[PDB]
């Protein structure tokens, strides 16, 4: 939630020296090195700011030293600018980040030529400011970044930046090919299950990516079979996360949106801009075409794969989950694992009962993918403020989602989330907990 | 939810000095102007409290500053009070907000007078505290509010501050019978379309029979409610059911039927509707004497026709009776529940960017209304553009509508929405803002 993370979304880490848009040798996280086509000077001005003319490649540790020195100089630049500083001080903490973002990118003085927009910002004429900035050469040169910044000025929010999900991806990615990070399928699976504790691309890694697909099973063990033999871009990671919680209907929207030419088939060209998915969906040399039935099945199998993996994680390798094991999963799924009241319900309110099978657990997970259908079906209960009894809940799940929850799954749900002891779940006790994570 | 959001529901924001039922001048979020026995005295008190010549009018930011001081002052009144602090310390976070709410409303000294109820709270005897507080003059003065606070003490959840619907029903209900309030079909229609406009009337058992009389003369389709007008009765529970119908996607029509069919025989009987004193809906579904069973096709038709009725009535409301909406009329409909700051930006965009182009037919309006039941699909479409780093220009907007509904919408509507919500004027749809306005517009009963 801060300028530093904003700018690592906006300015991408590059450990080799590189020409920018403007053509200047640059390095790290948008560090400007020299304004001289002399590359020899690019390693000189580099040196006394580093400890060595270069090393060819810088490494990340020092790249962050640079990035910190720039960000503060940027702030210092603004604070000692007559035109910028008043504006800067009228601004809330987030808008200041937006304006620091601007100076970091263009310099204190460039951002000082934006006379009118600066006026409007001080007046908190957010809308006129956003409109005027969007006509600038700066917008035209880097419109995706300028839009994110402008939206920050308009809304005083971080909605334009998804700082958390870019942080997850880098924390689990294990491969790199010229500044671009990559997950393996093992990395991807760990990232949806664990909070934490889970190199550069080579010709082996790429060759493994095809042969892995040749050896991996084609169903719900695809990613576990692949393991580290594969590659997933940041964009494909976000794509899978966006769709993996959806019912089938959401798969079909995603497919129709890829299918730009309308022939009910995805071509590698229609897919995002070789990864594991590209090879799976479009074959090795990129001329297989993906039909919806195959896409749907793939997404279904990945959902199942994730369910089976999480089941064995919380069962600790046993064939059945204890009710207490399912309860622990429920806390993490509902994002309530740090609320003491729920842990107390687990330890003290849960009968020893039958253990919970994989199939029962999968039915519960299937139900969770149809939550909005279930919420809509439950609206008379919710609007009436009428807490729901176990039997009525069971029936509603079956009617609204097709799923059969066992009394033992449902007993566990009710014992965990019934907070006032009436043996019923009010709207805030369960629906409110979900998606108001 | 927190004490701030709770009080924001319990205390209407008054940007102009307001004299409340208890006779106090108030401002902001329940800020009482105490040394003010007149309007002019209240302006003097307010000007000192804000440090500005306000003429009785403050800004949102000024209200928020007073609000924070008032909540801070309530907390301090609790922590420095021998009777209040031990109870507060003992309470969970939700019930602590309920105690701050009371001190905010009544003052530390007033709340400290509830000695037995306070004792019961500290002892975690929540039902018994609640029964005790409900008998008080405090409750009698502001019973809707006090009930929310007391129910928060009872359950320890925020349930009483969500899904609020009853106060709005009561606003519009024009009839009462033995303590229960009822809407006419006309009251219901007004409650759907208008923010606000009642002189409630009692009913004898004879008034009921004759009001319920004549149902067979009403139109069987999309004029049913308009044909009945004031000749019908709708209970609170039926009102909630009607609200659920209006927002309901076609995809959910059969599920809605099956939820009511509790014996699984593919028909709804009067006794199964009872799980939700004759009423219009009961007579229409189950006959005069409750003898008829309601089958799915008629139930689906009823829902479809109600949705059509609201759309036809709203179309003419904003077309002012003309056969086509102007683009500005469609904009007026769309923005009708938007709030002051954001509303001025959208209207600026209306005045400055819209061209009269082709006016908007009833069928085109209806198609837009149907689209609002596919907004999850539309949001997925927006995400797919975002992942592809594809700016959402008019063509992208059109395509997302087509994918979400399976039909193209008309250019006069899509181009109007796009010009309103191209907020930066860079030919990019601000689709998050658009969906926030739309979902709010279509969310009946708030
Ligand atoms: Ca295609
Ligand atoms: Ca409960
Ligand atoms: Ca039945």
UniProtKB/Swiss-Prot annotation, chain A:
Superkingdom of origin organism: Eukaryota
GO biological process: calcium import into the mitochondrion; cellular response to calcium ion; mitochondrial calcium ion homeostasis; mitochondrial calcium ion transmembrane transport; negative regulation of mitochondrial calcium ion concentration; positive regulation of mitochondrial calcium ion concentration
Keyword Zinc attached: no
Any one annotated GO CC term: mitochondrial inner membrane
GO molecular function ontology, one term from the record: calcium ion sensor activity
Residues noted as binding Ca(2+) 2 in the record, renumbered to the chain: 418, 420, 422, 424, 429
Binding site for Ca(2+) 1: 259, 261, 263, 265, 267, 270
TM helices/strands, residue ranges: none
Keywords: Disulfide bond, Membrane, Mitochondrion, Mitochondrion inner membrane, Phosphoprotein, Repeat, Transit peptide
Cellular compartments annotated: Mitochondrion intermembrane space; Mitochondrion inner membrane
Main location: mitochondrion
Domain EF-hand residue range list: 246-273, 274-305, 336-371, 405-437
Record annotation: effect of changing residue 395 to A: Abolished interaction with MICU1
Annotated family: Belongs to the MICU1 family. MICU2 subfamily.
Entry text on domains: EF-hand domains 1 and 4 have high affinity for calcium and act as sensors of mitochondrial matrix calcium levels. EF-hand domains 2 and 3 are degenerate.
Subunit structure, as described in the record: Heterodimer; disulfide-linked; heterodimerizes with MICU1. Component of the uniplex complex, composed of MCU, EMRE/SMDT1, MICU1 and MICU2 in a 4:4:1:1 stoichiometry.
General function of this protein: Calcium sensor of the mitochondrial calcium uniporter (MCU) channel, which senses calcium level via its EF-hand domains. MICU1 and MICU2 form a disulfide-linked heterodimer that stimulates and inhibits MCU activity, depending on the concentration of calcium. At low calcium levels, MICU1 occludes the pore of the MCU channel, preventing mitochondrial calcium uptake.
The protein's name in its UniProt record: Calcium uptake protein 2, mitochondrial
Residue span relative to the full protein: 85 to 394 of 434
Swiss-Prot record, chain B:
KW Disulfide bond (keyword) present: yes
GO biological process, one term: mitochondrial calcium ion transmembrane transport
Coiled coil spans: none
Chief site of localization: mitochondrion
One example GO MF annotation: protein heterodimerization activity
Residues covered by the EF-hand domain: 248-276, 277-309, 340-375, 409-444
Entry annotated with the keyword Repeat: yes
Superkingdom, natural source: Eukaryota
Chain's role: Calcium sensor of the mitochondrial calcium uniporter (MCU) channel, which senses calcium level via its EF-hand domains. MICU1 and MICU2 form a disulfide-linked heterodimer that stimulates and inhibits MCU activity, depending on the concentration of calcium. At low calcium levels, MICU1 occludes the pore of the MCU channel, preventing mitochondrial calcium uptake.
Subunit structure: Heterodimer; disulfide-linked; heterodimerizes with MICU1. Component of the uniplex complex, composed of MCU, EMRE/SMDT1, MICU1 and MICU2 in a 4:4:1:1 stoichiometry.
Listed name of the protein: Calcium uptake protein 2, mitochondrial
This protein's encoding gene: MICU2
Span of the entire protein shown here: 85 to 399 of 434
């Amino acid at each position: 939630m801060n300028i530093f993370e904003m700018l690592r979304i906006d300015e991408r880490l590059r450990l080799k020296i590189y020409k920018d848009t403007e053509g200047y040798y640059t390095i790290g996280i948008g560090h400007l090195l020299t304004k001289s086509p002399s590359l020899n000077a690019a390693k000189s001005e580099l040196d006394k700011a580093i400890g060595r003319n270069t090393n060819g490649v810088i490494t990340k540790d020092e790249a962050e030293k640079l990035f910190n020195q720039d960000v503060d100089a940027a702030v210092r630049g603004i604070l000692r600018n007559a035109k910028l500083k008043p504006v800067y001080d009228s601004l809330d903490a987030v808008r200041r980040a937006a304006l620091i973002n601007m100076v970091f990118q263009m310099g204190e003085t460039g951002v000082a030529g934006f006379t009118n927009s600066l006026r409007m910002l001080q007046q908190k004429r957010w809308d006129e400011a956003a409109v005027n900035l969007a006509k600038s050469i700066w917008y035209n040169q880097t419109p995706n970044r300028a839009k994110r910044v402008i939206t920050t000025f308009r809304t005083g929010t971080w909605d334009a930046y998804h700082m958390l999900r870019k942080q997850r991806f880098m924390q689990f990615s294990s491969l790199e090919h010229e500044g671009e990070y990559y997950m393996t399928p093992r990395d991807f699976l760990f990232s949806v299950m664990f909070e934490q504790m889970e190199k550069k691309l080579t010709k082996k890694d790429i060759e493994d990516t095809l042969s892995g697909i040749q050896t991996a099973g084609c169903g719900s063990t695809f990613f576990r079979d692949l393991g580290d033999k594969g590659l997933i871009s940041y964009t494909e990671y976000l794509f899978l996360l966006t769709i993996l919680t959806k019912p089938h209907s959401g798969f079909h929207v995603a497919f129709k949106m890829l299918d730009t030419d309308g022939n009910e088939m995805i071509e590698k060209r229609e897919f995002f801009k070789n990864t594991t998915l590209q090879m799976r969906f479009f074959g090795k040399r990129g001329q297989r075409k993906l039909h919806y039935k195959e896409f749907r099945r793939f997404m279904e199998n990945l959902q199942t794969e994730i369910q089976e993996m999480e089941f064995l994680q919380f069962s600790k390798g046993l064939s059945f989950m204890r009710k207490e094991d399912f309860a622990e999963w429920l806390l993490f799924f509902t994002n309530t694992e740090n609320k003491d009241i729920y842990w107390k319900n687990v330890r003290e309110k849960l009968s020893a009962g039958e253990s919970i099978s994989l199939d029962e657990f999968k039915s519960f997970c299937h139900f969770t993918t149809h939550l909005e259908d279930f919420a809509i079906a439950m609206q008379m209960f919710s609007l009436a403020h009428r807490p729901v009894r176990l039997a009525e809940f069971k029936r509603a799940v079956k009617v609204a989602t097709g799923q059969e929850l066992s009394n033992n799954i449902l007993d566990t749900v009710f014992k965990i989330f019934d907070l006032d002891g009436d043996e019923c779940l009010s709207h805030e006790e369960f629906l409110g907990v979900l998606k108001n994570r």
